[PDB]
Amino acid sequence: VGVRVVYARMFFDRMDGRIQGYVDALKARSPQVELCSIMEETAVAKDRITALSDQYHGTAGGRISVWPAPATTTAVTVEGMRWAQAFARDRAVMWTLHMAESDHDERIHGMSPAEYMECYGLLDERLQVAHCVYFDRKDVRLLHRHNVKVASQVVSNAYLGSGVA
Amino acid sequence: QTLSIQHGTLVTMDQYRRVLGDSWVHVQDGRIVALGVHAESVPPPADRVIDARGKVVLPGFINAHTHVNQILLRGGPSHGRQFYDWLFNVVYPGQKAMRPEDVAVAVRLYCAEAVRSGITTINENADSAIYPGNIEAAMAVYGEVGVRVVYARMFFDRMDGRIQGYVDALKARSPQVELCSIMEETAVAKDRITALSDQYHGTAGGRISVWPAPATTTAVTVEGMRWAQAFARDRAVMWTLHMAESDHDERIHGMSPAEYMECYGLLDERLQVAHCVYFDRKDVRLLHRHNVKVASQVVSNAYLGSGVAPVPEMVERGMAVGIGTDNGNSNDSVNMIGDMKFMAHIHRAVHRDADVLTPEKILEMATIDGARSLGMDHEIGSIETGKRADLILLDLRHPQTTPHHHLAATIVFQAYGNEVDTVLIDGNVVMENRRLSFLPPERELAFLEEAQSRATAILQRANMVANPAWRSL
Amino acid sequence: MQTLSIQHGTLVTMDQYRRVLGDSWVHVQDGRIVALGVHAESVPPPADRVIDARGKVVLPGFINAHTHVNQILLRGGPSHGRQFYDWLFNVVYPGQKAMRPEDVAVAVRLYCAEAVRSGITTINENADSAIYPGNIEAAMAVYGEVGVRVVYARMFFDRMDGRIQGYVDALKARSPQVELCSIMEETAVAKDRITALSDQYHGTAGGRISVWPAPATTTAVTVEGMRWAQAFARDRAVMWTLHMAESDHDERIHGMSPAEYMECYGLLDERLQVAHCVYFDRKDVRLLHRHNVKVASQVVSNAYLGSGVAPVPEMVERGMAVGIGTDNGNSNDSVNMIGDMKFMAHIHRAVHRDADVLTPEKILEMATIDGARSLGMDHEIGSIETGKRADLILLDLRHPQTTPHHHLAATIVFQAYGNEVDTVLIDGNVVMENRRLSFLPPERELAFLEEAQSRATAILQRANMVANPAWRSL
Ligand SMILES: [Fe+3]
Ligand SMILES: [Fe+3]
């Protein structure tokens, strides 16, 4: 096609046991539709993403890139996010993460996702966060301090009834 | 022995709030035995006369809730952190790294600053009493120094499994600093505190007291709190508890801490609660109903980013609300006058009301009301016959306190905290013309260098960053 | 050609890289900082005098971004417990009116004594009493003698706000024996008087004194008056300043915010310094930001008068130049930069429920380099850099309250009381040394304070103001 593409390969290496009951209820809305899991072991994800990068990064005349994309702060281990952060740094690319897209997400371990990331040194200039709806003054400040990049999905935030970033 | 304080302006904080120009106080065997006006009466003869000419005499300030040892952790390591972040990455590890000889220095440093700022009574909430030799080291210094001390021995007998993941995350901020636990079995705590009380309660000429201090409603069992409540009753003292200091400390078992305590019959007139930031109208009502005493740590509540307690609401209901400086390292000063000023302003600002708390009232919080909040208002907090001679002399002959007409206003809105000149505790001269009896000027600089050095070493031992990199945002 | 060397200090430069230089020295000549160095790497030049700063911390002099001096004689009982307009009309105006020039001279010396003691080297005097004859002359003589750096922002009012009359009459009934005063003046009269004042005093006392026009507020000044001030500032390469939205009775001029109104008339520019931003919304901040408007935040005073809490963190996070002002000597009621810095740090942490909303470093910047920026003077003052003026202070942290100390900004903001300043240089001149004031020596201090006390008492008698109200707990 000839389009310029960043292929941000998403991964999930952690079960969020807190919201299963809520998901089972949601599934009952369409019970004939199957409940799916795309979880994978941390090491398997690393391997798969590294392989993908080695194979496709820089291809199609420089038009294609590959980044690691830990899905969210609740669906990914600290080890997984640290890996992605290191990977972005070592290969001069970015890493990206979905952050606080619903009200069921906006606490992880008694703090905001941005706060939690700050605790583990996970906010840096090579991070691009997506979905900043459930953000407070402090979260903004943290992202600003570390020069975090942002992608706002304004229409979608509306479509899904999340709100306004 | 006898002491006569003469030609002062007496700000009594007595029943009628008398302010007595050119007047005198007669002190004997640690008690205020008489007062008079110089124009109407002649002071009794006395062993010693202190000339207070052109000076203001107050009851000694009362620090309703504080933590002393932590003072060695101020100066860089302690700021910028929410309550639990501060607690687990700074306070616990730092305290753990402290040796008894370090504690002795901390206490003397704290007292030096406190007395300098007019503070005569201290409610020490002691979280490091669990470590061997610490109590003995501290008590020796409190005794020597001559300050009036409530030693509130804190205990924790219950794990709060609910906040584990939060804490682990917080610890990752300083992963080189140890995660510490000072938990102890209920019976062990009872024994240790009872022993401590038996040994030290009433010592240093009645100047030292001991109370039980269940840490919080989430870190202490019902059995533990009931024991403390009963203990206070049986021994005619108080018990104290930290209540709702962060939004994670908010709801215990689906209700507020005050609600939870009410359920178990744990709110009574001998309870002094500290930290009332996360309080609602109902919580206030409950505390009011049972005549619970309060200590407000207004500066610290700000320092740690907790928020602003409903002090005016409590005060307007006649509740006994004292002022506490809180930790030496969540303030980061031990200066009642600076904290009074802050109490006055923060509440004016938030309520958008320039008269929400009169300076008179703020001054009452620091003195007579504070005494009340410690259950000690029969013994201290005012210049009245029969009460202990805990007294302070202020000199307003400085630029910042000029002019002065209304004394409360001048003290609250103008004074910096360096205007206290002479301090008497239990009739003993503990400071005179800013010269400290327990830390003479020829020894002062060397002592501060020792405190600096030990502090630095404590931080090395605890693996704590003393001086973080310049940071504007 | 005369010279001064400050040695063996820790230099907190507030320079471009925020350098903190241990065991280092500063060379001063002809009022300017001419060099700096580290003792281990270099030898200080010879100098006429050496000041040993061993074991001491060297900072740029604090900058009081917005204050009112003369009112200091009205502190001590008469001034507290009142909302802005109550305070203004029952205390400030009548009290100021009752002041004679000899009274003003004492006020200014007392103010300066306290200020210099607390490390303040530059003062933005918003002068509301310049309309009374002899006052300017008396004040300027003292500012000059004392050696402080002064911006004299001559306030004017050329417009009656008829909307607020009934409110004021009701307020006056609180103290009906005190006179209702007006300091209004015709637009052209104000222009003439300010222009004369500028011509006469701008640049005097060895460059230490400046003059700015100061239209009081958007409701008390005509558009023509504000435009004039704006043009004046531009033409004479100075600033103009305006009090903006300090009470909820101000918050709406002609159906919009003061900032909105000013925007409509092209009255927001980079030479404007606004004071008091309590009643600000997002949009107001945005407007100020767009035009690079400078700000002075009077955090303590906003509390004292029960106005509220300004959105300082919001403005600072946008890189705006926000300085700290102590405001009135009688709406604080101290002249103590260190105490006010502490308050700035805490009030905003508390309200935002955020322990790190403003770093102590940032607070310290507000008091120094950022404050200089907010006065349009950051090329001359606010940091320890070669080429800038030698406005410098020495702090001794060898006291109980500032022990221990590791991180200097944290220590100063969270621990220091304001009495730790030792030596103060302004424009290279030694104005205070070991707490001994050059313009108020210790053998003369107590007598002077007794004079200030007396005069204050007398001023209140003349104005028929209650000095010491009855004890009141509720
Ligand atoms: Fe506490
Ligand atoms: Fe002002």
Coordinates of C-alpha atoms in Angstrom, one line a residue, chain C:
Chain C
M1 CA 36.8 50.8 41.3
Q2 CA 36.4 49.7 44.9
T3 CA 36.0 45.9 45.5
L4 CA 34.5 43.2 47.6
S5 CA 35.2 39.4 47.8
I6 CA 32.9 36.9 49.3
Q7 CA 34.7 33.7 50.2
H8 CA 34.3 30.1 51.2
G9 CA 30.6 30.1 50.8
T10 CA 28.2 27.6 49.2
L11 CA 26.8 29.5 46.2
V12 CA 23.2 28.8 45.4
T13 CA 23.3 30.6 42.0
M14 CA 19.9 30.2 40.6
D15 CA 21.8 30.5 37.3
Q16 CA 20.8 28.9 34.0
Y17 CA 21.9 25.5 35.2
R18 CA 20.9 26.0 38.8
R19 CA 24.5 25.5 39.9
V20 CA 25.2 25.0 43.5
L21 CA 28.9 25.6 44.2
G22 CA 30.5 24.3 47.3
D23 CA 33.4 26.2 48.9
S24 CA 33.3 29.0 46.3
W25 CA 33.8 32.7 46.0
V26 CA 32.3 35.8 44.5
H27 CA 34.1 38.9 43.3
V28 CA 32.3 42.2 43.3
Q29 CA 33.2 45.5 41.9
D30 CA 31.3 48.8 41.3
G31 CA 28.1 47.1 42.3
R32 CA 28.4 44.3 39.8
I33 CA 29.3 40.6 40.1
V34 CA 32.5 40.5 38.0
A35 CA 33.6 36.9 38.7
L36 CA 32.9 33.6 40.5
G37 CA 35.1 30.6 41.2
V38 CA 35.6 27.4 43.0
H39 CA 38.3 27.7 45.7
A40 CA 39.8 24.3 44.9
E41 CA 40.2 25.3 41.2
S42 CA 41.1 28.9 41.4
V43 CA 42.3 31.8 43.5
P44 CA 40.0 34.8 44.2
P45 CA 41.2 38.1 43.0
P46 CA 42.6 40.6 45.5
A47 CA 40.0 42.9 46.9
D48 CA 39.7 45.9 49.2
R49 CA 37.5 43.8 51.6
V50 CA 37.0 40.1 52.2
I51 CA 33.8 38.7 53.7
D52 CA 34.4 35.2 55.1
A53 CA 31.3 33.1 54.4
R54 CA 32.8 30.0 55.8
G55 CA 30.0 27.5 56.7
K56 CA 27.4 29.7 55.1
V57 CA 25.0 29.8 52.2
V58 CA 25.0 32.5 49.6
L59 CA 21.8 33.4 47.6
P60 CA 20.6 36.1 45.4
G61 CA 18.7 38.6 47.4
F62 CA 15.1 37.9 47.8
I63 CA 12.7 39.8 45.7
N64 CA 9.4 41.1 47.2
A65 CA 7.3 41.2 44.0
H66 CA 4.5 43.2 45.3
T67 CA 4.1 45.0 48.6
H68 CA 2.7 48.1 50.3
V69 CA 5.1 49.7 52.8
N70 CA 3.5 52.6 54.7
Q71 CA 0.7 50.5 56.1
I72 CA 3.1 48.7 58.3
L73 CA 2.3 51.2 61.0
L74 CA -1.3 49.9 61.0
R75 CA -0.4 46.3 62.0
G76 CA -0.7 45.1 65.6
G77 CA -4.5 44.9 66.2
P78 CA -6.5 47.3 64.0
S79 CA -6.1 45.4 60.7
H80 CA -7.1 41.7 61.1
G81 CA -10.5 39.9 60.9
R82 CA -11.8 41.8 57.9
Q83 CA -12.6 41.0 54.3
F84 CA -10.7 43.0 51.6
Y85 CA -13.1 46.1 51.3
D86 CA -13.9 46.2 55.0
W87 CA -10.1 46.3 55.7
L88 CA -9.6 48.8 52.9
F89 CA -12.1 51.4 53.9
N90 CA -12.2 51.0 57.7
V91 CA -8.4 50.7 58.2
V92 CA -6.2 51.3 55.2
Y93 CA -7.4 54.5 53.7
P94 CA -8.2 56.4 56.9
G95 CA -5.0 55.2 58.6
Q96 CA -2.9 56.3 55.6
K97 CA -4.7 59.6 55.5
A98 CA -3.8 60.2 59.2
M99 CA -0.1 59.7 58.5
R100 CA 2.2 62.7 58.3
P101 CA 5.4 62.7 56.2
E102 CA 7.6 62.2 59.3
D103 CA 5.4 59.1 60.1
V104 CA 5.9 57.8 56.6
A105 CA 9.7 58.1 56.9
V106 CA 9.6 56.0 60.1
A107 CA 7.3 53.4 58.4
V108 CA 9.7 53.0 55.5
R109 CA 12.7 52.6 57.8
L110 CA 10.8 50.0 60.0
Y111 CA 9.7 48.1 56.9
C112 CA 13.1 48.1 55.4
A113 CA 14.7 47.0 58.7
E114 CA 12.4 44.0 58.8
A115 CA 12.8 43.3 55.1
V116 CA 16.6 43.4 55.0
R117 CA 16.7 41.2 58.2
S118 CA 14.7 38.5 56.3
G119 CA 16.9 38.7 53.2
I120 CA 14.8 41.0 51.0
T121 CA 16.9 43.2 48.7
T122 CA 14.4 44.4 46.2
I123 CA 11.0 45.8 47.0
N124 CA 8.1 46.5 44.6
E125 CA 6.4 49.3 46.6
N126 CA 2.8 49.8 45.4
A127 CA 2.2 53.3 46.7
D128 CA -1.4 54.2 47.4
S129 CA -0.5 57.2 49.6
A130 CA 1.7 59.1 47.0
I131 CA -1.2 61.5 46.4
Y132 CA -0.6 63.2 49.8
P133 CA 2.0 66.2 49.8
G134 CA 5.4 65.5 51.2
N135 CA 5.0 61.8 51.4
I136 CA 6.9 60.9 48.3
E137 CA 9.9 63.1 49.3
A138 CA 10.0 61.6 52.8
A139 CA 9.8 58.0 51.6
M140 CA 12.4 58.4 48.8
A141 CA 14.9 60.0 51.1
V142 CA 14.7 56.9 53.3
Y143 CA 14.8 54.3 50.5
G144 CA 17.8 56.1 49.2
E145 CA 19.7 56.2 52.5
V146 CA 18.8 52.6 53.4
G147 CA 20.3 51.3 50.2
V148 CA 17.5 48.9 49.2
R149 CA 16.5 48.3 45.6
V150 CA 13.1 49.8 45.0
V151 CA 10.5 49.8 42.3
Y152 CA 8.1 52.7 43.2
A153 CA 4.8 51.8 41.6
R154 CA 2.8 55.0 41.9
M155 CA -0.9 53.9 42.1
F156 CA -3.7 56.0 40.7
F157 CA -7.5 55.9 40.6
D158 CA -9.4 58.0 38.0
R159 CA -12.8 56.4 38.1
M160 CA -15.7 55.9 40.5
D161 CA -17.2 52.5 40.7
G162 CA -20.8 53.5 41.4
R163 CA -21.9 49.8 41.6
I164 CA -20.1 49.2 45.0
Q165 CA -21.3 52.3 46.9
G166 CA -24.1 50.8 49.0
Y167 CA -21.7 47.9 50.0
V168 CA -19.1 50.4 51.2
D169 CA -21.5 52.5 53.1
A170 CA -22.7 49.4 55.0
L171 CA -19.0 48.4 55.6
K172 CA -18.3 51.9 57.0
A173 CA -21.0 51.5 59.6
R174 CA -18.8 48.8 61.2
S175 CA -16.5 51.7 62.3
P176 CA -18.7 54.8 61.8
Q177 CA -16.4 57.1 63.7
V178 CA -13.7 56.5 61.1
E179 CA -13.9 58.7 58.0
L180 CA -14.9 57.6 54.6
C181 CA -12.0 58.6 52.3
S182 CA -11.5 59.1 48.5
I183 CA -8.1 59.3 46.8
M184 CA -9.5 59.7 43.3
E185 CA -7.8 62.1 40.9
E186 CA -8.5 63.4 37.3
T187 CA -6.8 61.3 34.6
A188 CA -4.5 64.2 33.4
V189 CA -3.5 65.2 37.0
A190 CA -2.4 61.6 37.6
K191 CA -0.4 61.5 34.3
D192 CA 1.3 64.8 35.2
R193 CA 2.1 63.8 38.8
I194 CA 3.5 60.3 37.8
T195 CA 5.5 61.7 34.9
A196 CA 7.0 64.3 37.2
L197 CA 7.8 61.7 39.8
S198 CA 9.4 59.5 37.2
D199 CA 11.5 62.4 35.7
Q200 CA 12.7 63.3 39.2
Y201 CA 13.4 59.9 40.8
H202 CA 13.7 57.3 38.1
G203 CA 17.3 56.0 38.1
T204 CA 18.3 57.9 41.3
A205 CA 20.1 56.5 44.3
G206 CA 22.7 54.9 42.0
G207 CA 20.2 53.1 39.7
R208 CA 18.5 51.6 42.8
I209 CA 15.2 53.4 42.5
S210 CA 12.7 53.0 39.6
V211 CA 9.3 54.4 39.0
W212 CA 6.3 52.6 37.4
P213 CA 2.8 53.7 36.7
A214 CA 0.2 51.6 38.6
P215 CA -3.4 51.9 37.6
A216 CA -5.1 50.6 40.7
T217 CA -7.7 48.1 39.2
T218 CA -9.8 47.6 36.1
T219 CA -12.8 49.0 37.9
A220 CA -11.1 52.1 39.4
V221 CA -9.3 53.2 36.3
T222 CA -10.5 54.3 32.9
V223 CA -9.5 52.7 29.7
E224 CA -7.7 55.9 28.8
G225 CA -5.7 55.7 32.1
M226 CA -4.7 52.1 31.6
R227 CA -3.7 52.7 28.0
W228 CA -1.6 55.6 29.1
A229 CA 0.2 53.5 31.7
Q230 CA 0.7 50.8 29.1
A231 CA 2.3 53.3 26.6
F232 CA 4.4 54.9 29.4
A233 CA 5.9 51.6 30.4
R234 CA 6.7 50.8 26.8
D235 CA 8.2 54.3 26.0
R236 CA 10.3 54.4 29.1
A237 CA 11.4 50.7 29.1
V238 CA 9.8 49.9 32.5
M239 CA 6.7 47.9 33.5
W240 CA 3.2 48.8 34.5
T241 CA 1.2 47.0 37.1
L242 CA -2.4 46.5 38.1
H243 CA -4.4 44.8 41.0
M244 CA -6.6 42.3 39.4
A245 CA -9.5 40.4 40.9
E246 CA -8.7 40.4 44.7
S247 CA -12.3 40.1 45.9
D248 CA -15.6 38.5 44.7
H249 CA -17.0 42.1 44.3
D250 CA -14.4 42.8 41.6
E251 CA -14.7 39.6 39.7
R252 CA -16.9 41.0 37.0
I253 CA -16.3 44.4 35.2
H254 CA -18.9 45.0 32.5
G255 CA -20.0 41.3 32.4
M256 CA -16.6 39.8 32.0
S257 CA -13.5 39.0 34.1
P258 CA -10.9 41.8 34.5
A259 CA -8.5 39.8 32.3
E260 CA -11.2 39.4 29.6
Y261 CA -12.0 43.1 29.7
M262 CA -8.3 44.0 29.4
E263 CA -8.0 41.6 26.5
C264 CA -10.9 43.4 24.7
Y265 CA -9.0 46.7 24.9
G266 CA -5.5 45.3 23.9
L267 CA -4.4 45.9 27.6
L268 CA -2.6 42.6 28.2
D269 CA 1.1 42.7 27.2
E270 CA 4.6 41.5 28.3
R271 CA 5.3 44.7 30.3
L272 CA 2.3 44.2 32.5
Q273 CA 2.6 42.8 36.0
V274 CA -0.7 41.8 37.5
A275 CA -1.1 41.2 41.2
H276 CA -3.7 39.1 43.1
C277 CA -4.9 36.3 40.9
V278 CA -7.4 34.6 43.3
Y279 CA -10.6 34.9 41.3
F280 CA -9.2 33.5 38.1
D281 CA -10.5 30.8 35.8
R282 CA -8.9 28.7 33.2
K283 CA -9.5 31.2 30.5
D284 CA -8.1 34.1 32.4
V285 CA -4.9 32.1 32.9
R286 CA -4.8 31.3 29.2
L287 CA -5.1 35.0 28.3
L288 CA -2.4 36.1 30.6
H289 CA -0.2 33.3 29.3
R290 CA -0.8 34.2 25.6
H291 CA 0.5 37.7 26.2
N292 CA 3.3 36.8 28.5
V293 CA 1.8 38.8 31.4
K294 CA 3.9 38.8 34.6
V295 CA 2.4 37.8 37.9
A296 CA 2.8 38.6 41.6
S297 CA 1.2 36.2 44.0
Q298 CA 0.4 37.5 47.5
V299 CA -0.4 34.1 49.0
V300 CA -0.3 35.0 52.7
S301 CA -2.4 38.2 52.3
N302 CA -5.0 36.3 50.2
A303 CA -5.4 34.1 53.2
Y304 CA -5.3 36.9 55.8
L305 CA -8.1 38.9 54.1
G306 CA -10.2 35.7 53.5
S307 CA -10.0 36.1 49.7
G308 CA -8.9 32.6 49.0
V309 CA -6.2 30.7 47.1
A310 CA -4.8 31.6 43.7
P311 CA -4.0 29.1 40.9
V312 CA -0.3 29.5 41.2
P313 CA 0.7 25.9 40.3
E314 CA -1.4 26.2 37.1
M315 CA 0.5 29.4 36.1
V316 CA 3.9 28.0 37.1
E317 CA 3.3 24.8 35.2
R318 CA 2.8 27.0 32.1
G319 CA 6.2 28.7 32.6
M320 CA 4.7 32.0 33.5
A321 CA 6.8 34.4 35.5
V322 CA 5.3 34.3 39.0
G323 CA 6.9 36.1 41.8
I324 CA 6.1 36.2 45.5
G325 CA 4.8 39.4 47.2
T326 CA 4.3 39.9 51.0
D327 CA 1.6 42.5 50.2
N328 CA 0.7 45.1 52.8
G329 CA 2.7 45.4 56.0
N330 CA -0.8 45.2 57.6
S331 CA -2.4 42.3 55.6
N332 CA 0.2 39.6 56.4
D333 CA 1.3 40.9 58.9
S334 CA 5.1 40.3 58.5
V335 CA 7.7 41.3 56.0
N336 CA 9.4 37.9 55.9
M337 CA 10.1 36.2 52.6
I338 CA 11.1 32.9 54.2
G339 CA 7.9 32.6 56.2
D340 CA 5.9 33.4 53.1
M341 CA 7.8 30.9 51.0
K342 CA 6.9 28.2 53.5
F343 CA 3.3 29.3 53.3
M344 CA 3.3 29.2 49.5
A345 CA 4.7 25.7 49.7
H346 CA 2.1 24.4 52.1
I347 CA -1.1 26.1 51.2
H348 CA -0.9 24.7 47.7
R349 CA 0.1 21.2 48.8
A350 CA -3.0 21.2 51.1
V351 CA -5.5 22.5 48.7
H352 CA -4.3 20.3 45.8
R353 CA -3.9 17.3 48.1
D354 CA -0.5 16.8 46.6
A355 CA 2.8 16.8 48.5
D356 CA 4.8 17.7 45.4
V357 CA 2.7 20.3 43.7
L358 CA 5.6 22.8 44.1
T359 CA 9.1 21.8 44.9
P360 CA 11.0 23.8 47.4
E361 CA 13.5 24.6 44.6
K362 CA 10.6 26.1 42.6
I363 CA 9.4 28.2 45.6
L364 CA 12.9 29.4 46.0
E365 CA 13.0 30.4 42.3
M366 CA 9.8 32.4 42.8
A367 CA 11.5 34.3 45.5
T368 CA 14.6 35.0 43.4
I369 CA 15.1 34.6 39.7
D370 CA 11.4 34.1 38.7
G371 CA 10.6 37.1 40.9
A372 CA 13.1 39.2 39.0
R373 CA 11.5 38.0 35.8
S374 CA 8.1 39.1 37.0
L375 CA 9.6 42.6 37.5
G376 CA 11.2 42.6 34.1
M377 CA 14.5 42.9 35.8
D378 CA 15.9 39.4 35.3
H379 CA 18.8 40.7 33.2
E380 CA 20.1 42.8 36.2
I381 CA 19.1 40.8 39.3
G382 CA 17.8 37.5 40.7
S383 CA 20.8 35.2 40.2
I384 CA 24.5 34.9 41.1
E385 CA 26.0 35.4 37.6
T386 CA 28.8 37.5 36.2
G387 CA 27.4 40.8 34.8
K388 CA 24.5 41.0 37.2
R389 CA 24.1 43.3 40.2
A390 CA 25.7 42.2 43.5
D391 CA 22.4 41.8 45.4
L392 CA 23.4 38.9 47.7
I393 CA 22.6 37.4 51.0
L394 CA 24.4 35.1 53.4
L395 CA 22.4 32.6 55.5
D396 CA 23.8 30.8 58.4
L397 CA 22.2 27.4 58.8
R398 CA 24.0 26.7 62.1
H399 CA 20.9 26.9 64.2
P400 CA 18.6 24.3 65.8
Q401 CA 15.7 24.7 63.4
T402 CA 17.9 24.4 60.3
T403 CA 19.7 21.3 61.6
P404 CA 20.2 19.0 60.0
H405 CA 20.4 20.4 56.5
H406 CA 21.4 18.6 53.4
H407 CA 19.1 19.8 50.6
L408 CA 19.4 23.6 50.8
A409 CA 16.2 24.6 49.2
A410 CA 14.1 22.2 51.3
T411 CA 15.9 23.4 54.4
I412 CA 15.3 27.0 53.7
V413 CA 11.7 26.6 52.7
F414 CA 10.5 24.0 55.3
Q415 CA 12.8 24.8 58.3
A416 CA 14.1 28.3 58.4
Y417 CA 12.1 30.9 60.4
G418 CA 13.5 34.1 58.8
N419 CA 16.1 35.1 61.3
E420 CA 19.0 33.1 59.7
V421 CA 20.1 35.8 57.4
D422 CA 23.3 37.3 58.4
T423 CA 24.9 39.6 55.9
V424 CA 23.1 41.4 53.1
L425 CA 24.6 43.2 50.1
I426 CA 22.6 45.4 47.8
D427 CA 24.3 46.8 44.7
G428 CA 27.6 45.8 46.2
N429 CA 26.9 47.8 49.4
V430 CA 26.9 46.2 52.8
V431 CA 23.5 46.9 54.2
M432 CA 23.5 44.3 57.0
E433 CA 26.4 42.4 58.5
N434 CA 26.2 39.8 61.3
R435 CA 22.6 41.0 61.7
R436 CA 23.8 44.6 62.4
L437 CA 21.9 47.0 60.1
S438 CA 23.9 49.8 58.6
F439 CA 20.9 52.1 58.5
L440 CA 19.6 51.2 62.0
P441 CA 22.5 50.4 64.3
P442 CA 21.8 48.3 67.5
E443 CA 22.6 51.1 69.9
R444 CA 19.7 53.2 68.1
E445 CA 17.3 50.3 67.4
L446 CA 15.2 50.1 70.7
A447 CA 14.6 53.8 70.7
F448 CA 13.5 53.8 67.1
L449 CA 11.0 51.0 67.7
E450 CA 9.6 53.0 70.7
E451 CA 9.3 55.9 68.3
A452 CA 7.4 53.7 65.7
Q453 CA 5.1 52.3 68.4
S454 CA 4.3 55.9 69.6
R455 CA 3.6 57.3 66.2
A456 CA 1.5 54.3 65.3
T457 CA -0.6 54.8 68.5
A458 CA -1.0 58.5 67.6
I459 CA -1.9 57.8 64.0
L460 CA -4.7 55.5 65.2
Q461 CA -5.9 58.3 67.7
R462 CA -6.0 60.8 64.8
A463 CA -7.9 58.4 62.6
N464 CA -10.3 57.4 65.4
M465 CA -9.4 53.8 65.0
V466 CA -9.6 51.1 67.6
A467 CA -6.1 49.8 68.3
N468 CA -6.7 47.0 70.8
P469 CA -10.2 45.5 70.5
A470 CA -11.7 43.6 73.4
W471 CA -10.8 39.9 73.9
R472 CA -12.8 37.8 71.5
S473 CA -12.8 34.0 71.2
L474 CA -15.6 33.6 68.7

